[PDB]
Amino acid sequence: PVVTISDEPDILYKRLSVLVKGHDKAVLDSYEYFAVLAAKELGISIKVHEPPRKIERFTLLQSVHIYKKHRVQYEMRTLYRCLELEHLTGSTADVYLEYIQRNLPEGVAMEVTKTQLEQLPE
Amino acid sequence: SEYAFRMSRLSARLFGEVTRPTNSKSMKVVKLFSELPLAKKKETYDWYPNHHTYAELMQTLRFLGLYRDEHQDFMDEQKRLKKLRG
Amino acid sequence: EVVIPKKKTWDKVAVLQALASTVNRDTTAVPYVFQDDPYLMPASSLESRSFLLAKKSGENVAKFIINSYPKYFQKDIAEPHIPCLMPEYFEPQIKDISEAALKERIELRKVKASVDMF
Amino acid sequence: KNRAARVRVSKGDKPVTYEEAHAPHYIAHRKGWLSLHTGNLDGEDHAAERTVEDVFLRKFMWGTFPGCLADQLVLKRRGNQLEICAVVLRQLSPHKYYFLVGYSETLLSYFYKCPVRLHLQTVPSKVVYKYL
Amino acid sequence: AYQVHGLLKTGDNWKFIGPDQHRNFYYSKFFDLICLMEQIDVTLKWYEDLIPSAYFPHSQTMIHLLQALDVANRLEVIPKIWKDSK
Amino acid sequence: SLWDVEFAKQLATVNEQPLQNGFEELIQWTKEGKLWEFPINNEAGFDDDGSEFHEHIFLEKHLESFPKQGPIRHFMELVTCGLSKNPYLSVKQKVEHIEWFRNYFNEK
Amino acid sequence: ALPPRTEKMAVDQDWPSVYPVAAPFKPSAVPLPVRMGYPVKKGVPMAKEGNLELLKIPNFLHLTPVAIKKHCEALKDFCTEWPAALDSDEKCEKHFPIEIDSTDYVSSGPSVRNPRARVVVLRVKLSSLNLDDHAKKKLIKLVGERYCKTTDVLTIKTDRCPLRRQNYDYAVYLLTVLYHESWNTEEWEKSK
Amino acid sequence: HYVDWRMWRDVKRRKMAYEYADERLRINSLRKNTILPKILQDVADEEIAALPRDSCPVRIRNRCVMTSRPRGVKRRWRLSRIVFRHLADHGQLSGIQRATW
Ligand SMILES: [Mg+2]
């Protein structure tokens, strides 16, 4: 349990919101449970949101040589789940964020995280 | 007016775009140097897998016997049965 | 008044060391080096040693192939550069008779080559 | 007629696995995907080279575990941890198995430059979902 | 024996087992002694805690694993340890 | 020298023990560097000699002032703003771009 | 083969210990006869010992609620607390004025170069500036496309230098020299 | 060891466009700018038209990363229609469904 309390005052992270893009809603909401209970026993305030799915549909030909009238159509289901953390500490950041980041799913997982750190003007 | 023109000049000097009034046919210069050319992009020059490390390592590993490719087995065998007669 | 606290600084391993402290050893499982398939579990100590030395064989066997052909693995893709993953060069690159070539052959531990060129 | 990934009906003696049996219209309605890489989502760059490496892995492991891969592989890709989970049969010797595991374990690490891990899963006989 | 098994369990001192042959000798002797003077319930508890997770029993131990059961007259455990040995 | 580094090697051998867990696989993988640094900063390594914001976009220190009222100096404003709005090139390739034009502009 | 560890395993045996890390299924390890796959007409969903469908499922076996709770006993070491900066947004605005957007885009595979991860945008309030009278007019006319009127927020964006920290430097430098040029009275302010 | 000669012909095109990109870039801007004299460009013209005709980014044909087919390529995966159909229909390309809207 090496801790190493070092020197300078905190970076004061406001609204570290994680936008989770995926191909599978069942992985996304299992992830929601894993992060919601982790934030519950972490003490950090979490909220849930569902940024709406985008389908990238596109058309190709079906036959190799001719018959342009007979076509195939393929689609991508991109779904988003927003997990916005508000009022969290800089030390609180690279331990929760880190736990989740390492314990990310596979190809159905992105973790786009925006950070609004506060500060004083100069 | 003149104040709007030179206020845009002050803002340009501040933020870092071109200061004096220029036209679009020359502003294409700063847009150029601001982006990469068609050939310098990562995807453009890395379009094809070089195919040599790939296929030649397959050659060497098959000749070391750690890789069995059924396709080369076919051509090996067919070329033998063709060299028997051709 | 803001009690703005100082950030305690961690290394890159301490979280995962605390995670091992979370997962104490499984009293019912074989060591993680072996696979979990019931056909591939070693049954005896001799069989386990045989499997481990076969795995170590496969390791210096890939090292031999990769060091014999470094040209097929020169393309780095990971950022940052991982010099423990780039191939090792064992052939002396300095062919002229020089003390730099002596240092190169000593570093490559080529005893006979170092003696001959000395 | 559509002939894409449809094993046609023989005479009722053709062993076939869940994967081969399902046709492309069941591609995530009943089957799912055999390779889990993130590049085909909305915003990402490198999906093309992920697929170029994907077909490579399928054919390398096909030619390197010669005639023992029961059904096709699961090339998942989380972090820099590429994984080649397998369903390999129970015919070759375990020392040979551990050897080709190690050989691959290190060779794809030095080809793709990241952690590559093979978690074999030995099976007695090639499975049959239905006889077509 | 329990004292230095405790010294082993202090922190990372388990690392100072080192190689597999030393590990097998260490745990073989520990289990011999557990069978020779411990009570049969804690011997079977150490059996399930150590085998096969810590080490693979050597041929001799098998015989000894039994002598303790014969002394304790717990011959009902014979089929399961036989199955484990097989 | 070779004796102290060889003592380091042998100390590593006498403290090399089996991995015994999937977490310790990641321990060794970070320890070597094949595993990524987590959490990631999308800019690990990638220092650019401490460019720090004034070499990249204020090219006046490399401008090498000619008479400023000339069309050439206008060009240098235009090309300077282009290299300022370049984020893909670093300061060193910006200054070799400048010297290309400097060399050639003189060449004429 | 071998009789599996599944029926060797009993109840009250620690599952965080059984699965430490994220790993694909391994049904021999798994003590659950979980069945997957559209069944046959007069049959059941396919068994557990050989399925590829049970392999291709992400597999959140490694992280069970109790594993979360015990995981963070240790993960609790590494956190301070926030001050009484209050949930009140006006209170944290008074206490710490500016706001900055500085994000990462984590991918998955060989590299971590996503260039668009250098986007840095800065939002500041003039009611938190407090030292702006007629010098405000200056700031507005200077920043043309920013300052939406309904909320009094200035948003300056930098994506001009490759690194995120010097982008943060460009936000703060442009803020302070915009501030100093706004408080710089110039000779043509009267002939408006 | 390239799928065909035409693919190998572009791999050559790609290479020497990528190496010969800076020189062309410099003289070309100099072309479409309005600052230098009408005659001060005629010279730069020579350099460009004289810079070799296998690096001009007008000859780059985004062909197939697996099987040289010029027309019928989808850029996002660098694959032709029928090869992308084969992989997405065998189910080794994640996320690609069959469009049923
Ligand atoms: Mg039809």
UniProtKB/Swiss-Prot annotation, chain A:
Keyword set includes Aminoacyl-tRNA synthetase: no
One GO CC term on file: mitochondrial matrix
Predominant subcellular localization, coarse grouping: mitochondrion
Keywords: Mitochondrion, Ribonucleoprotein, Ribosomal protein
Record GO biological process: mitochondrial translation
Subcellular localization(s) per the UniProt record: Mitochondrion
Family: Belongs to the universal ribosomal protein uS10 family.
Subunit relationships: Component of the mitochondrial small ribosomal subunit (mt-SSU). Mature mammalian 55S mitochondrial ribosomes consist of a small (28S) and a large (39S) subunit. The 28S small subunit contains a 12S ribosomal RNA (12S mt-rRNA) and 30 different proteins. The 39S large subunit contains a 16S rRNA (16S mt-rRNA), a copy of mitochondrial valine transfer RNA (mt-tRNA(Val)), which plays an integral structural role, and 52 different proteins.
Name of the featured protein: Small ribosomal subunit protein uS10m
Taxonomic source organism: Homo sapiens
Full protein stretch here: 61 to 182 of 201
From Swiss-Prot, chain E:
Compartments where located: Mitochondrion
Superkingdom field: Eukaryota
Annotated PPR repeat ranges: 23-57, 58-86
Tissue expr: Abundant in testes, skeletal muscle and heart tissue.
Position of the signal peptide: none
Family according to the record: Belongs to the mitochondrion-specific ribosomal protein mS39 family.
Quaternary assembly: Component of the mitochondrial small ribosomal subunit (mt-SSU). Mature mammalian 55S mitochondrial ribosomes consist of a small (28S) and a large (39S) subunit. The 28S small subunit contains a 12S ribosomal RNA (12S mt-rRNA) and 30 different proteins. The 39S large subunit contains a 16S rRNA (16S mt-rRNA), a copy of mitochondrial valine transfer RNA (mt-tRNA(Val)), which plays an integral structural role, and 52 different proteins. Associated with the 12S mitochondrial rRNA (12S mt-rRNA).
Role played: Mitochondrial RNA-binding protein that has a role in mitochondrial translation.
Disease: Combined oxidative phosphorylation deficiency 51: An autosomal recessive, mitochondrial disorder characterized by intrauterine growth retardation, low birth weight, poor overall growth, progressive limb rigidity, delayed psychomotor development, hearing loss, and optic atrophy. Brain imaging shows abnormal bilateral signs at the basal ganglia and brainstem. Patient cells show decreased mitochondrial complex I and IV levels and activities, and generalized mitochondrial translation defects.
Organism this protein belongs to: Homo sapiens (Human)
UniProtKB/Swiss-Prot annotation, chain G:
Molecular-function GO terms, alphabetical: RNA binding; structural constituent of ribosome
Compartments, record wording: Mitochondrion
Subunit details: Component of the mitochondrial small ribosomal subunit (mt-SSU). Mature mammalian 55S mitochondrial ribosomes consist of a small (28S) and a large (39S) subunit. The 28S small subunit contains a 12S ribosomal RNA (12S mt-rRNA) and 30 different proteins. The 39S large subunit contains a 16S rRNA (16S mt-rRNA), a copy of mitochondrial valine transfer RNA (mt-tRNA(Val)), which plays an integral structural role, and 52 different proteins.
A GO CC annotation given for this chain: mitochondrial inner membrane
Family listed: Belongs to the mitochondrion-specific ribosomal protein mS35 family.
Protein's recorded name: Small ribosomal subunit protein mS35
Keywords recorded for this protein, A-Z: Coiled coil, Mitochondrion, Ribonucleoprotein, Ribosomal protein, Transit peptide
Positions spanned in the full protein: 52 to 243 of 323
Main location: mitochondrion
GO biological process: mitochondrial translation
UniProtKB/Swiss-Prot annotation, chain H:
Organism of origin: Homo sapiens (Human)
Encoding gene, per UniProt annotation: MRPS14
Disease implication from the record: Combined oxidative phosphorylation deficiency 38: An autosomal recessive disorder due to mitochondrial dysfunction and characterized by perinatal hypertrophic cardiomyopathy, growth retardation, muscle hypotonia, elevated lactate, dysmorphy and intellectual disability.
GO cellular component, one term: mitochondrial inner membrane
Subunit record text: Component of the mitochondrial small ribosomal subunit (mt-SSU). Mature mammalian 55S mitochondrial ribosomes consist of a small (28S) and a large (39S) subunit. The 28S small subunit contains a 12S ribosomal RNA (12S mt-rRNA) and 30 different proteins. The 39S large subunit contains a 16S rRNA (16S mt-rRNA), a copy of mitochondrial valine transfer RNA (mt-tRNA(Val)), which plays an integral structural role, and 52 different proteins. Interacts with LIAT1.
Keywords: Disease variant, Mitochondrion, Primary mitochondrial disease, Ribonucleoprotein, Ribosomal protein
Compartment(s): Mitochondrion
Name of protein: Small ribosomal subunit protein uS14m
Top-level taxon of origin: Eukaryota
An individual GO BP term: translation
GO molecular function, one term: RNA binding
Residues of the full protein shown: 28 to 128 of 128
